[PDB]
From Swiss-Prot:
Interacts with p53/TP53; the interaction is direct. Interacts (via CTD region) with CDK9 and CCNT1, acting as an associated component of P-TEFb complex. Interacts with RELA (when acetylated at 'Lys-310'). Interacts (via NET domain) with NSD3, CHD4, BICRA and ATAD5. The interaction with BICRA bridges BRD4 to the GBAF complex. Interacts (via NET domain) with JMJD6 (via JmjC and N-terminal domains); the interaction is stronger in presence of ssRNA and recruits JMJD6 on distal enhancers. Interacts with NSD3. Interacts with NIPBL. This is Bromodomain-containing protein 4. The chain holds residues 44 to 167 of 1362 of the full protein. The lineage of its organism: Eukaryota, Metazoa, Chordata, Craniata, Vertebrata. Phosphorylation by CK2 disrupt the intramolecular binding between the bromo domain 2 and the NPS region and promotes binding between the NPS and the BID regions, leading to activate the protein and promote binding to acetylated histones. In absence of phosphorylation, BRD4 does not localize to p53/TP53 target gene promoters, phosphorylation promoting recruitment to p53/TP53 target promoters. Ubiquitously expressed. It is found in: Nucleus; Chromosome. Chromatin reader protein that recognizes and binds acetylated histones and plays a key role in transmission of epigenetic memory across cell divisions and transcription regulation. Remains associated with acetylated chromatin throughout the entire cell cycle and provides epigenetic memory for postmitotic G1 gene transcription by preserving acetylated chromatin status and maintaining high-order chromatin structure. During interphase, plays a key role in regulating the transcription of signal-inducible genes by associating with the P-TEFb complex and recruiting it to promoters. It comes from Homo sapiens. Residues 17-123 form the Bromo domain. The NET domain mediates interaction with a number of chromatin proteins involved in transcription regulation (NSD3, JMJD6, CHD4, GLTSCR1 and ATAD5).
Amino acid sequence: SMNPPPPETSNPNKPKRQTNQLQYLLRVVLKTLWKHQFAWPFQQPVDAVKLNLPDYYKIIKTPMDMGTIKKRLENNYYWNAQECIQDFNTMFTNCYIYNKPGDDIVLMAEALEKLFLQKINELPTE
Ligand SMILES: Cc1cc(/N=N/c2ccc(S(=O)(=O)Nc3ccccn3)cc2)cc(C)c1O
């Protein structure tokens, strides 16, 4: 199997804005996660070809990753903070669906997700 195309990151037909929450999501949340020691599995789409995971996109129908999220933020692709938060949650969920408890990658996801949730608890006002 081929990899699916990556998620769209730009769309001139989708309205754009910058909000304090979206700024925080890029500058604090994304950037903090991105530099973490456990970020590497999550910095780009899962390359099921390169990793020889033929079933990955048979199981995961809503792929998402931080590279995509970063580009969406940088492109002002999101209108609502919740769209971005949802993308992060989808990314984590995919990991938990595909992988098993105690797998290194699941422990990595848990740790990154705990940091993510901590940071979104600090989202500034609307
Ligand atoms: C979310 C997710 C990621 C993944 N594999 N991801 C990668 C990402 C990057 C590399 S890397 O080889 O470019 N960089 C590395 C590889 C190992 C340690 C540090 N950096 C390898 C696997 C595999 C699975 C199932 C999965 O559910």
